[PDB]
Amino acid sequence: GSNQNNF
Ligand SMILES: [Zn+2]
């Protein structure tokens, strides 16, 4: 699975 962090 792909991941995205929007800090
Ligand atoms: Zn993954």
Side-chain angles (χ1 to χ4, degrees):
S2 294
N3 309 59
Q4 186 200 56
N5 288 301
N6 299 321
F7 292 93

